[PDB]
Each structure stands twice: as C-alpha cells, then as structure tokens.
C-alpha cells in the first residue's frame, strides 16, 4: 500500500586496507527500513560511503639533511696556529641525518664536507673601502617606523697566495679558500675605522596582513 | 579537536588533495607524514611532515613613485619548527623599496 | 695484546701520529672480499692508497693479510665489511703479516655512519684520510 522505503543503519562491507595510520574502509546500507511496498519509491541518495579506519600504527619516516654546520677552525696537524701564514689547513662542517622512525630510509650521500683553507682569523691586513652596498631591507618589515641602509664597508687586500696546493700522495691539486674573520686596517673615512652606514625611510609601506584572512575585508 | 585529513600535499600550490574523512585528529591524520590536514574548509593546507619554509611570495604591488611592497614565506609542515625555532603556521615577511615610473 | 695495536678510545689527533711512526710504509682502506681460515689468510681489496710503501699497489687490486690462530676471535674480520689498516716495512712477506705494530679499525659503512654512534669516528676517519692524502706525515 503505497509504502516508501526508508534506510536501514550503516555496516562496514570491507576490511581496513592499511598497514600504518588511516585508511579507508567501505560503510554500505539497506533500503529495508521499510521496505518499499506497492509502488513506494527506493530510498533517496546512496547505499554505500567511505569510512576512516585508524590502525593507531606509525608509518615509516625516511630521514631528511637538515643543512651543514658551520665550517670548523682552519687547521693543520702538528701546528699550533697557521692563521696569518701562507700555510694550506683543513677544515669540515657536518649536517645531520634527521626525522627517520620505525624503519624509515636513511639520508642519501655524504654527512662531512672537507676543504682546505688559508686561516687569516684576526690577522691584521692593509683595508680598502667598498663603494657603497645596494640598499637593503626595509625594517622592521611590519613594525613601526621601517628604515633601509647601505655601507660602505673597510674591505681587506687578500694575499696573492695560490689558488691551489699540490697534494703529497695523488698527481693532484686542491682548492684552498681562505677562512676567518680578518682585521682590516683602513684610514678613516668619515671619521670611522669599519664600516660607514646611512639610512633612510621606507616610503608608503602597507600593513602585514595574512593572506589566509585577508580578502575577507567587507570593512 | 577534529580535522580533514588528506592522503596528499601538493608543493607546487600548498594545497590538500584526496580527502579520507573529517572527525580525527591532527596527530592521527599525521601518523602518515605524506598526509596533510585542514583545521575547517577553506582554511590552509599543512603538511604532515616535519616543517621548513614555504618559497617566498612574489613582490605585492608597489602602492608612480617610489613606494614599498612586501613579500611572504611561512613555515608548514607538522611537529618541529624552522629555522629561527619558529613553529608551523607563521609568516615571516620582508619590506622593499620599489618604483613603477616616474610621475 | 701482541695480535695488533690493541687500543680511553682513539682520537684523531692519535690517529695521525700513529700512522706517521717510523717504518710505517703502508696506510690502506681496504674491503675484506673473502676469508680463507686454517694462519689464516685475509684476502683484502684495497679502495684507497692512503699511504703508499715499497709495494706499489694499484686502487681496486687484492693483498692476503696473514695472522696466527691465536689472533682470529681477537681481530674478530666479517667479510664485504671495510677496515683502515697500516703496518710496518717489517711486517712484509708478497702478502702481509698481521702484528703487534699493526692498525686494523673497523670503518663502518656510508650509511650507518649517519648512526649516532657512528659519527665521530667516521668524521675523524674522512679528516684523517684528507690529512693524510693532501698533506702527508710531518718531519
Ligand atoms: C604495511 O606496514 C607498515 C608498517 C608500512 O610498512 C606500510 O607501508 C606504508 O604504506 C602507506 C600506505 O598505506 C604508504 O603511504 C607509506 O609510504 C608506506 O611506507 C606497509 O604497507
Ligand atoms: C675548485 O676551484 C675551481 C676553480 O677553477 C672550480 O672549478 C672547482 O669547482 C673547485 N672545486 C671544489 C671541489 O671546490
Ligand atoms: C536514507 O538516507 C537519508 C538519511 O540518511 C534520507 O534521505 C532518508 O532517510 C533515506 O531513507
Ligand atoms: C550511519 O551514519 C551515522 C552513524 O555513523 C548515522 O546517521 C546512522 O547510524 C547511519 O546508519
Ligand atoms: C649546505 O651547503 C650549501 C650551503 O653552503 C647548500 O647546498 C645547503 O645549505 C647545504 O645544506
Ligand atoms: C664556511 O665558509 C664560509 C665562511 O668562511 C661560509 O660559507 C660559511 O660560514 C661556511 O660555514
Ligand atoms: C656611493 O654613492 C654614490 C652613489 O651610489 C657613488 O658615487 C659611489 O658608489 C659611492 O660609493
Ligand atoms: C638603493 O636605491 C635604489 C634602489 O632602491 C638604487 O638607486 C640603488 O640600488 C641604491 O643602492
Ligand atoms: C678607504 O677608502 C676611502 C676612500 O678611498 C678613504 O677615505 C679612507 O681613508 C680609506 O682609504
Ligand atoms: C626566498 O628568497 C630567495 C629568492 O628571492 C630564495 O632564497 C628562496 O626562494 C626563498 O624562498
């Protein structure tokens, strides 16, 4: 007698497809609660849905390089100090292999890089001044007042030393950069020993606003 | 409190993509770092993997004269932070200098 | 222990002058590629001449290390594994003798280096090698 049908509960139909985390699984119902009867219409929409099932299960995490350290004191064995000397050292900086769980990759190629180095830490060298350095940032970038700034910077005269050292062992040659924070001696320009700075203001500057929430401005 | 959790990220556009359902947590969703999540739609898109920085933005229009415009990177991804120990979420801008013409 | 140079842990500042003692002729990186026991006869591919002697071996080319029954659970070698190994003039065969004045270090593989407890011995043992290769031993 004209009876529409009416769904029935939700039952899962398949087994959880994962081995680690959330998956999907498949819900299914009937159309028996009630039963369409004497031209009654089949329920209005779907019989089956996707459902979450959670193994509560950690995944694998492959390793990822976070970037390298600082390159070491340049050095050589068997020596005191090189620095100030035309004497190749070596120095290295390390990265770690980090994130890796529960049988994860490990990290590809190599966790040491060495190179070789003339030490000028704190040696005094004759010192030229740079023309002026481009403008940098306006700062702060969001915070009140931003101003910009350029320098002219007392800039060391380098040793014409090799660009090279001849190995002991292989018919070979390595690069050898300098390393270390040098004491340029320069005349004073603009009554200053270092570094001469100007600055100026930032000119218009917008406010920071978060994209996320921004163009959600009906005021 | 629950989240959309999707079975891909797409680095390219920082969008979700493959929706498995709502009602779980972050922590759940994330117990597969190649996942990502949306705390209510429309809302942005975070990684499941551990954090690094977003490419900055381009340059914002410039406001004839020489006004300044800003560009963006946030940090996304999920437990840990970016450099400066900056936790997952944050935006950290940079201000210019800038000329369209000359009026 | 008079089976090899039984060794507070070794530094690298130890290391390079250790392999930089009077006789020492030799300093290879080698790659155990097969055991043969009975004196038993290590069969050493050598990857790298970090110091090369009187025997002008080739990169990629086979020595067998000898050393008594006595020394085999001591030197403990499992093979494919590689070691930095050197060793006096004296200890020559032509093969090598395994002695008292002898350096056999296990150098863990590129990938467990990344290990914890792994990493300063395999960052000490690339210094070392680069020092030695580059700048040679002093004196
Ligand atoms: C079953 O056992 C688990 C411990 C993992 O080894 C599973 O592999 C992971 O499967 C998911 C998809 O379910 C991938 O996204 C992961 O990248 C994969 O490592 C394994 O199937
Ligand atoms: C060494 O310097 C030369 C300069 O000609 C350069 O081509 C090369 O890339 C450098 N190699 C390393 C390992 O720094
Ligand atoms: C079943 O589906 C929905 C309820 O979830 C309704 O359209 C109606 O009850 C139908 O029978
Ligand atoms: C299935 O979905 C929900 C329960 O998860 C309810 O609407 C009802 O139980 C339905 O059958
Ligand atoms: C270290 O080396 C360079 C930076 O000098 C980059 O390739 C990257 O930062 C890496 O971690
Ligand atoms: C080592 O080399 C220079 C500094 O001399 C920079 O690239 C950086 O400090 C690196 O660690
Ligand atoms: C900086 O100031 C002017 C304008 O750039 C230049 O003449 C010179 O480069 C100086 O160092
Ligand atoms: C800074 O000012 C403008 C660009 O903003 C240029 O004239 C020049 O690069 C200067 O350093
Ligand atoms: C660095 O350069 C400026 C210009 O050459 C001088 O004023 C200063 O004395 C030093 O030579
Ligand atoms: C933004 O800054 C520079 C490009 O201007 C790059 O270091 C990198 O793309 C970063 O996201």
Redesign the interface.
């Known amino acids: 007698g004209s009876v529409a049908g009416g769904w029935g509960p939700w039952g899962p139909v398949s087994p959880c497809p994962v081995t680690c985390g959330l998956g999907q699984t498949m819900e299914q119902r009937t159309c028996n609660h009630p039963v369409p009867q004497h031209g009654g219409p089949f329920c209005a929409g779907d019989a089956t849905r996707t459902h979450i099932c959670n193994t509560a299960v950690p995944c694998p995490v492959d390793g990822e390089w976070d970037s390298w350290g600082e390159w070491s004191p340049c050095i050589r064995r068997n020596m005191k100090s090189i620095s100030c000397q035309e004497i190749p050292g070596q120095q290295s900086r390390g990265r770690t292999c980090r994130g890796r769980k529960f049988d994860g990759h490990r990290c590809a190629g190599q966790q040491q890089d060495i190179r070789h180095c003339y030490s000028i830490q704190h040696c005094p060298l004759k010192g030229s001044w740079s023309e002026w350095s481009t403008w940098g940032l306006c700062m702060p970038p969001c915070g009140p007042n931003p101003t910009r700034a350029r320098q002219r910077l007392c800039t060391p005269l380098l040793p014409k030393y090799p660009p090279t050292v001849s190995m002991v062992e292989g018919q070979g040659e390595k690069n050898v950069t300098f390393w270390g924070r040098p004491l340029p001696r320069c005349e004073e320009l603009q009554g200053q020993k270092l570094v001469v700075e100007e600055k100026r203001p930032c000119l218009h500057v917008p406010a920071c606003k978060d994209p996320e929430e921004e163009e959600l401005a009906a005021a | 409190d629950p989240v959309l959790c999707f079975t891909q990220y797409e680095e390219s556009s920082g969008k979700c993509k493959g929706l498995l359902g709502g009602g779980v947590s972050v922590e759940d969703c994330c117990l597969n770092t190649a996942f990502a999540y949306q705390k209510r739609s429309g809302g942005l898109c975070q990684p499941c993997r551990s954090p690094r920085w977003s490419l900055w933005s381009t340059w914002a229009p410039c406001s004839c004269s020489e006004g300044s415009q800003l560009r963006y990177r946030r940090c996304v991804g999920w437990n840990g932070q970016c450099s400066g120990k900056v936790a997952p979420g944050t935006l950290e801008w940079q201000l210019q200098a800038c000329e369209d013409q000359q009026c | 222990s008079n089976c090899f140079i039984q060794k507070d842990k070794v530094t690298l500042?130890e290391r390079?002058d250790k392999a930089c003692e009077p006789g020492v002729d030799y300093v290879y990186k080698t790659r155990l590629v097969k055991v043969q026991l009975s004196f038993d006869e290590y069969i050493m591919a050598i990857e790298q001449?970090?110091?090369?002697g009187s025997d002008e071996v080739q990169v990629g080319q086979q020595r067998t290390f000898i050393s008594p029954i006595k020394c085999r659970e001591a030197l403990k070698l499992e093979e494919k594994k590689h070691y930095l190994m050197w060793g006096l003039s004296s200890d020559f065969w032509l093969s090598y003798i395994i002695g008292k004045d002898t350096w056999v270090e296990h150098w863990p593989e590129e990938?467990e280096?990344?290990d914890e407890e792994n990493?300063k011995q395999?960052?000490d043992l690339?210094?070392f090698t680069?020092?030695?290769?580059?700048?040679?031993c002093?004196n």
């Open positions: 500042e390079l001449t970090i110091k090369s990938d280096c990344q990493q395999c960052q690339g210094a680069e020092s030695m290769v580059v700048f040679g002093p």
